[PDB]
Design a protein around this motif. Structure first.
Motif, PDB file in Angstrom:
ATOM      1  N   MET A   1       0.867  -1.210   0.000  1.00  0.00           N
ATOM      2  CA  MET A   1       0.000   0.000   0.000  1.00  0.00           C
ATOM      3  C   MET A   1       0.891   1.244   0.000  1.00  0.00           C
ATOM      4  SD  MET A   1      -2.977   1.210   2.653  1.00  0.00           S
ATOM      5  CE  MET A   1      -3.504   2.922   2.708  1.00  0.00           C
ATOM      6  N   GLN A   2       0.671   2.133  -0.983  1.00  0.00           N
ATOM      7  CA  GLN A   2       1.423   3.371  -1.132  1.00  0.00           C
ATOM      8  C   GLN A   2       0.791   4.445  -0.247  1.00  0.00           C
ATOM      9  OE1 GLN A   2       4.264   3.855  -2.658  1.00  0.00           O
ATOM     10  NE2 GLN A   2       4.447   2.049  -3.962  1.00  0.00           N
ATOM     11  N   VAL A   3       1.610   5.086   0.605  1.00  0.00           N
ATOM     12  CA  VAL A   3       1.175   6.169   1.480  1.00  0.00           C
ATOM     13  C   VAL A   3       2.149   7.341   1.349  1.00  0.00           C
ATOM     14  CG1 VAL A   3       0.021   4.596   3.104  1.00  0.00           C
ATOM     15  CG2 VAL A   3       2.381   5.283   3.559  1.00  0.00           C
ATOM     16  N   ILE A   4       1.685   8.531   1.761  1.00  0.00           N
ATOM     17  CA  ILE A   4       2.504   9.732   1.857  1.00  0.00           C
ATOM     18  C   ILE A   4       2.737   9.992   3.344  1.00  0.00           C
ATOM     19  CG2 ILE A   4       2.810  12.121   1.120  1.00  0.00           C
ATOM     20  CD1 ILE A   4       0.196  11.614  -0.660  1.00  0.00           C
ATOM     21  N   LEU A   5       4.011  10.039   3.767  1.00  0.00           N
ATOM     22  CA  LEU A   5       4.359  10.287   5.160  1.00  0.00           C
ATOM     23  C   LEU A   5       4.116  11.763   5.483  1.00  0.00           C
ATOM     24  CD1 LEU A   5       7.675   8.219   5.499  1.00  0.00           C
ATOM     25  CD2 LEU A   5       5.310   7.437   5.635  1.00  0.00           C
ATOM     26  N   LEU A   6       3.584  12.030   6.687  1.00  0.00           N
ATOM     27  CA  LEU A   6       3.224  13.368   7.137  1.00  0.00           C
ATOM     28  C   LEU A   6       4.139  13.771   8.293  1.00  0.00           C
ATOM     29  CD1 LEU A   6      -0.676  13.116   7.028  1.00  0.00           C
ATOM     30  CD2 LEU A   6       0.897  13.829   5.213  1.00  0.00           C
ATOM     31  N   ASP A   7       4.146  12.962   9.362  1.00  0.00           N
ATOM     32  CA  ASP A   7       5.161  13.041  10.400  1.00  0.00           C
ATOM     33  C   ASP A   7       6.379  12.258   9.909  1.00  0.00           C
ATOM     34  OD1 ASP A   7       6.559  12.837  13.062  1.00  0.00           O
ATOM     35  OD2 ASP A   7       4.661  13.671  13.809  1.00  0.00           O
ATOM     36  N   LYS A   8       7.556  12.557  10.478  1.00  0.00           N
ATOM     37  CA  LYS A   8       8.755  11.765  10.240  1.00  0.00           C
ATOM     38  C   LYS A   8       8.594  10.426  10.961  1.00  0.00           C
ATOM     39  CE  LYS A   8      13.017  13.523  10.145  1.00  0.00           C
ATOM     40  NZ  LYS A   8      14.214  14.231  10.655  1.00  0.00           N
TER      41      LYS A   8
ATOM     42  N   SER B   1      10.667  10.646   5.560  1.00  0.00           N
ATOM     43  CA  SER B   1      10.336  11.979   6.046  1.00  0.00           C
ATOM     44  C   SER B   1       9.084  12.492   5.334  1.00  0.00           C
ATOM     45  CB  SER B   1      11.520  12.899   5.849  1.00  0.00           C
ATOM     46  OG  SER B   1      11.882  12.978   4.477  1.00  0.00           O
ATOM     47  N   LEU B   2       8.619  13.697   5.717  1.00  0.00           N
ATOM     48  CA  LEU B   2       7.445  14.350   5.139  1.00  0.00           C
ATOM     49  C   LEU B   2       7.502  14.314   3.610  1.00  0.00           C
ATOM     50  CD1 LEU B   2       4.980  16.579   5.666  1.00  0.00           C
ATOM     51  CD2 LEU B   2       6.798  18.179   5.080  1.00  0.00           C
ATOM     52  N   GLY B   3       6.398  13.862   2.989  1.00  0.00           N
ATOM     53  CA  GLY B   3       6.235  13.869   1.542  1.00  0.00           C
ATOM     54  C   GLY B   3       6.863  12.672   0.824  1.00  0.00           C
ATOM     55  N   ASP B   4       7.426  11.703   1.568  1.00  0.00           N
ATOM     56  CA  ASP B   4       8.080  10.546   0.977  1.00  0.00           C
ATOM     57  C   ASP B   4       7.004   9.531   0.589  1.00  0.00           C
ATOM     58  OD1 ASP B   4       9.674   7.885   0.895  1.00  0.00           O
ATOM     59  OD2 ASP B   4      11.291   9.345   1.208  1.00  0.00           O
ATOM     60  N   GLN B   5       6.979   9.148  -0.698  1.00  0.00           N
ATOM     61  CA  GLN B   5       6.142   8.063  -1.189  1.00  0.00           C
ATOM     62  C   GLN B   5       6.821   6.746  -0.820  1.00  0.00           C
ATOM     63  OE1 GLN B   5       3.258   8.840  -2.371  1.00  0.00           O
ATOM     64  NE2 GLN B   5       3.466  10.855  -3.321  1.00  0.00           N
ATOM     65  N   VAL B   6       6.114   5.872  -0.085  1.00  0.00           N
ATOM     66  CA  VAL B   6       6.670   4.595   0.341  1.00  0.00           C
ATOM     67  C   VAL B   6       5.577   3.526   0.322  1.00  0.00           C
ATOM     68  CG1 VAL B   6       6.388   5.130   2.829  1.00  0.00           C
ATOM     69  CG2 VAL B   6       8.069   3.418   2.099  1.00  0.00           C
ATOM     70  N   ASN B   7       5.972   2.302  -0.059  1.00  0.00           N
ATOM     71  CA  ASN B   7       5.109   1.134  -0.025  1.00  0.00           C
ATOM     72  C   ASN B   7       5.239   0.486   1.354  1.00  0.00           C
ATOM     73  OD1 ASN B   7       3.256  -0.403  -1.858  1.00  0.00           O
ATOM     74  ND2 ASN B   7       4.577  -2.111  -1.272  1.00  0.00           N
TER      75      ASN B   7
ATOM     76  N   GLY C   1      -2.062   9.590  12.334  1.00  0.00           N
ATOM     77  CA  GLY C   1      -1.768  10.802  11.582  1.00  0.00           C
ATOM     78  C   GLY C   1      -0.309  10.911  11.135  1.00  0.00           C
ATOM     79  N   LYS C   2       0.364   9.763  10.961  1.00  0.00           N
ATOM     80  CA  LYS C   2       1.763   9.704  10.562  1.00  0.00           C
ATOM     81  C   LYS C   2       1.887   9.647   9.041  1.00  0.00           C
ATOM     82  CE  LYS C   2       3.869   7.444  14.621  1.00  0.00           C
ATOM     83  NZ  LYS C   2       3.172   8.287  15.624  1.00  0.00           N
ATOM     84  N   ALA C   3       0.955   8.947   8.377  1.00  0.00           N
ATOM     85  CA  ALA C   3       0.856   8.936   6.926  1.00  0.00           C
ATOM     86  C   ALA C   3      -0.589   9.174   6.498  1.00  0.00           C
ATOM     87  CB  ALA C   3       1.378   7.627   6.385  1.00  0.00           C
ATOM     88  N   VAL C   4      -0.763   9.379   5.185  1.00  0.00           N
ATOM     89  CA  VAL C   4      -2.063   9.468   4.536  1.00  0.00           C
ATOM     90  C   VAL C   4      -2.003   8.594   3.281  1.00  0.00           C
ATOM     91  CG1 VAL C   4      -1.438  11.631   3.308  1.00  0.00           C
ATOM     92  CG2 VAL C   4      -3.849  11.084   3.682  1.00  0.00           C
ATOM     93  N   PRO C   5      -3.104   7.915   2.864  1.00  0.00           N
ATOM     94  CA  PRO C   5      -3.139   7.212   1.577  1.00  0.00           C
ATOM     95  C   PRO C   5      -2.784   8.102   0.384  1.00  0.00           C
ATOM     96  CG  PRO C   5      -5.049   6.587   2.893  1.00  0.00           C
ATOM     97  CD  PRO C   5      -4.341   7.698   3.638  1.00  0.00           C
TER      98      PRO C   5
END
Ligand SMILES: [K+]
Ligand SMILES: [K+]
Ligand SMILES: [K+]
Ligand SMILES: [K+]
Ligand SMILES: [K+]
Ligand SMILES: [K+]
Ligand SMILES: [K+]
Ligand SMILES: [K+]
Ligand SMILES: [K+]
Ligand SMILES: [K+]
Ligand SMILES: [K+]
Ligand SMILES: [K+]
Ligand SMILES: [K+]
Ligand SMILES: [K+]
Ligand SMILES: [K+]
Ligand SMILES: [K+]
Ligand SMILES: [K+]
Ligand SMILES: [K+]
Ligand SMILES: [K+]
Ligand SMILES: [Mg+2]
Ligand SMILES: [Mg+2]
Ligand SMILES: [Mg+2]
Ligand SMILES: [Mg+2]
Ligand SMILES: [Mg+2]
Ligand SMILES: [Mg+2]
Ligand SMILES: [Mg+2]
Ligand SMILES: [Mg+2]
Ligand SMILES: [Mg+2]
Ligand SMILES: [Mg+2]
Ligand SMILES: [Mg+2]
Ligand SMILES: [Mg+2]
Ligand SMILES: [Mg+2]
Ligand SMILES: [Mg+2]
Ligand SMILES: [Mg+2]
Ligand SMILES: [Mg+2]
Ligand SMILES: [Mg+2]
Ligand SMILES: [Mg+2]
Ligand SMILES: [Mg+2]
Ligand SMILES: [Mg+2]
Ligand SMILES: [Mg+2]
Ligand SMILES: [Mg+2]
Ligand SMILES: [Mg+2]
Ligand SMILES: [Mg+2]
Ligand SMILES: [Mg+2]
Ligand SMILES: [Mg+2]
Ligand SMILES: [Mg+2]
Ligand SMILES: [Mg+2]
Ligand SMILES: [Mg+2]
Ligand SMILES: [Mg+2]
Ligand SMILES: [Mg+2]
Ligand SMILES: [Mg+2]
Ligand SMILES: [Mg+2]
Ligand SMILES: [Mg+2]
Ligand SMILES: [Mg+2]
Ligand SMILES: [Mg+2]
Ligand SMILES: [Mg+2]
Ligand SMILES: [Mg+2]
Ligand SMILES: [Mg+2]
Ligand SMILES: [Mg+2]
Ligand SMILES: [Mg+2]
Ligand SMILES: [Mg+2]
Ligand SMILES: [Mg+2]
Ligand SMILES: [Mg+2]
Ligand SMILES: [Mg+2]
Ligand SMILES: [Mg+2]
Lengths: 45, 77, 41
Positions: free
Chosen positions: C1-8, C14-20, C34-38
């Motif tokens: 599942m791909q998410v965008i990190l919000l908190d480190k 870090s913030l804005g990192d696309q990660v599976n 509230g650490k990542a968002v879809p």
RNA sequence: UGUUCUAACGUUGACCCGUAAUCCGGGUUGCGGACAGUGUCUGGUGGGUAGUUUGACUGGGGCGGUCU
RNA sequence: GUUUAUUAAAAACACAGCACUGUGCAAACACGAAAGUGGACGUAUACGGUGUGACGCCUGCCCGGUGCCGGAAGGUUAAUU
RNA sequence: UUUUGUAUAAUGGGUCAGCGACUUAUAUUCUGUAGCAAGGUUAACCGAAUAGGGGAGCCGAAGGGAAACCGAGUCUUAACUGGGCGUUAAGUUGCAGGGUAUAGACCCGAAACCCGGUGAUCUAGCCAUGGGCAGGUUGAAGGUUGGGUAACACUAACUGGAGGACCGAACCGACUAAUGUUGAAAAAUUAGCGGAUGACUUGUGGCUGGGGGUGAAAGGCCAAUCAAACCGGGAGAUAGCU
RNA sequence: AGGGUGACAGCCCCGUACACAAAAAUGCACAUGCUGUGAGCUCGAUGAGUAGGGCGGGACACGUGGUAUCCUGUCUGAAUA
RNA sequence: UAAGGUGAUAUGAACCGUUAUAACCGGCGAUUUCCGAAUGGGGAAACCCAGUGUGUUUCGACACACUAUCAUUAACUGAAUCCAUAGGUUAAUGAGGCGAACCGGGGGAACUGAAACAUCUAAGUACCCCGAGGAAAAGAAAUCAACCGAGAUUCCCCCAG
């Protein structure tokens, strides 16, 4: 000798009476069949 | 009842078949799990009884879209 | 599942990192805290 | 290539509220914790239960013998 | 004590007592697609199952077969890949 | 009627009256008959139309070969001196009939299997709440007192009132015999018999439901029904049998 | 047509053919109101846990067969003119 | 519409009516106990027992109306818990039950046939359940066809045992 029919009006009504028939789907189907046949006496009541 | 609240998946019937092709009736049940879903719009957890498939639907569509669909049907949660 | 990190988040980025991530990690931890968002867009 | 962790999940621990309620739900907390458990698939076991089969000849039938 | 109401009352069943065995509690086990409920508002001096059948003296040898219990190196072996 | 064979002492029928068993639909083949004839005939449907329309189709006029394919031939085989099937016989549509097929298929008849209901007013077990047990016996533990003991233990008398204890009515049973057996009674009566303070008995109400219950276990009992209740349905199950 | 009348009736009676009828309520068919509903045109858009797949089953005349196609309990998973 | 009439067994009695308020027939109204979905609570159907509001009383009481449940919507209110949400009360609207077949859907036998029987058959039949309508369902091609074309769905006759 003691025969099988030992009458009790309370047990008669609780077992087979109108309200006992009305309490379940299958009892209501008894009443439906007996109305459809045109019975003068629907229940023991 | 064994019904997925998201997808409406429910038990379906079919056959067991032996090697000799004897058919006996069986059921196939959904892979249901009660799960607490975080609803960030409402700031709370909503428990749904969902199939694993329904969980993948929630991941794809988001819980807000799914709960809106449940409200349209009248499926309460 | 791909998410965008919000908190480190540690061991991720870090913030804005696309990660599976595994779907369970996102669903049950990162998103509710509230650490990542879809990664919707 | 060990265990540890908590956040899914369990709780037939405690307490709080809905509430006049040993149900239920929600909350707080402890314990357990990716185990348990359930779905699909799959090997084993399975007279617990079910459907059945278990030949014919024959100085009655069976036993023996026979069947091309 | 119990039993084949209506041809069998018994030497049959039960029985206290005995033994084996399961069961750590959300117990085993049972009824139930389930929720639950019984077991028990009991907790191993308890509860279930099995056999034996007061009491007395006793209960020998065989684990190869079938079961159960334990093992887990090796052989064989499913879905899957 | 059934049989090798029946006066048979094998079957069936007391008698009469009434009813009671080869049908119906569709397909298919053969026979008869009628029409038309190398053709015959339409289905649904249209039509107020038994008319008329409708030729979609179907059967026939060509067969051979697994087939492509060839064709009065064709297949077989590398190929027939050959050999197989064909050419050398009029069909088709009604109507009536014989047979066959599918349907309950000549009529009546199982034991059973499955589905949905109804039943614990009988009975089995349990649950709650009430009731019953004349009269007579026996004399456990314990207690008191005396004796006894270092103190116990012990031991005598009195007391005490235990028990799936004893004898015996009510009450609950059912061991024997006779009677009865188209009964007084679809299980009793009479004379005897067992238990009778209990694992007792009984009233009222409740709960357990059919591959299910309940069972101090007899496959017992679950409404005069039990190795799978009853009622309705599948249903005209099936019946190489009578 | 048919029925009745002391036996069998065109002409005895009730009907029948035919011709007529509604204060009131009401079905229907058109008609024109009001209320809501919005057509036309140009430009753009074109149904994703889906199609498809693996496993199990079911449905298709089609019994897994060399088995297309459909449905989906389970695990997955596109391209989107 | 009328010279007769007060339903039947079924006569009688006491009456009504004859030019239109007798009876009779039709339209529209009125009345319509109790039980029954039964709905104020209960209940062994046709019974037992209430609450609240109004109105009337001869102070004994009396009459009438409303008060089920669920769904949706709105208002007022309202925990643990700060906001809140759950929850609570009231109002409006709808539902409920019955009914022969046909219809769509959820489940789904066995006897039987196979001259036994298990695949197969019987049959997606019987039956149970849910839901609907005057019909239902289906329906406007991700359909067929075969290089020619057809043009949603449904039903009938063929194709063809
Ligand atoms: K917890
Ligand atoms: K696990
Ligand atoms: K012989
Ligand atoms: K002989
Ligand atoms: K005896
Ligand atoms: K052994
Ligand atoms: K004979
Ligand atoms: K004889
Ligand atoms: K014929
Ligand atoms: K002919
Ligand atoms: K030839
Ligand atoms: K002819
Ligand atoms: K039949
Ligand atoms: K026949
Ligand atoms: K049975
Ligand atoms: K006449
Ligand atoms: K799929
Ligand atoms: K069968
Ligand atoms: K047979
Ligand atoms: Mg079958
Ligand atoms: Mg596991
Ligand atoms: Mg077995
Ligand atoms: Mg067997
Ligand atoms: Mg069979
Ligand atoms: Mg047999
Ligand atoms: Mg023989
Ligand atoms: Mg005795
Ligand atoms: Mg006996
Ligand atoms: Mg006896
Ligand atoms: Mg328990
Ligand atoms: Mg013994
Ligand atoms: Mg003879
Ligand atoms: Mg002679
Ligand atoms: Mg003679
Ligand atoms: Mg004779
Ligand atoms: Mg004979
Ligand atoms: Mg005779
Ligand atoms: Mg030919
Ligand atoms: Mg004929
Ligand atoms: Mg009963
Ligand atoms: Mg005694
Ligand atoms: Mg007895
Ligand atoms: Mg006597
Ligand atoms: Mg005695
Ligand atoms: Mg005595
Ligand atoms: Mg025996
Ligand atoms: Mg009996
Ligand atoms: Mg049976
Ligand atoms: Mg049948
Ligand atoms: Mg028969
Ligand atoms: Mg005459
Ligand atoms: Mg599209
Ligand atoms: Mg496709
Ligand atoms: Mg698919
Ligand atoms: Mg495929
Ligand atoms: Mg598949
Ligand atoms: Mg299949
Ligand atoms: Mg094949
Ligand atoms: Mg009521
Ligand atoms: Mg009421
Ligand atoms: Mg009351
Ligand atoms: Mg057979
Ligand atoms: Mg209607
Ligand atoms: Mg429609
Ligand atoms: Mg084209």
């Amino acid at each position: 000798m003691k025969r099988t029919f030992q009458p009790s009006v309370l047990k008669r009504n609780r077992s087979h009476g109108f309200r006992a028939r009305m309490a379940t789907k299958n009892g209501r189907q008894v009443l439906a069949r007996r109305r459809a046949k045109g019975r003068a006496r629907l229940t023991v009541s | 009842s064994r019904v997925c609240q998201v997808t409406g998946k429910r038990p379906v019937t079919g056959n067991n078949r032996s090697h000799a092709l004897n058919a006996t009736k069986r059921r196939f049940l959904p892979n249901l799990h009660s799960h607490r879903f975080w609803v960030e719009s409402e700031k709370r957890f909503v428990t749904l009884r969902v199939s694993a498939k329904g969980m993948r639907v929630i991941d794809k569509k988001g819980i807000d879209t799914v709960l809106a669909e449940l409200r349209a049907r009248g499926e309460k949660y | 599942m791909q998410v965008i990190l919000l908190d480190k988040v540690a061991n991720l980025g870090s913030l804005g990192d696309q990660v599976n991530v595994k779907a369970g990690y996102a669903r049950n931890f990162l998103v509710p805290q509230g650490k990542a968002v879809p990664a919707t867009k």
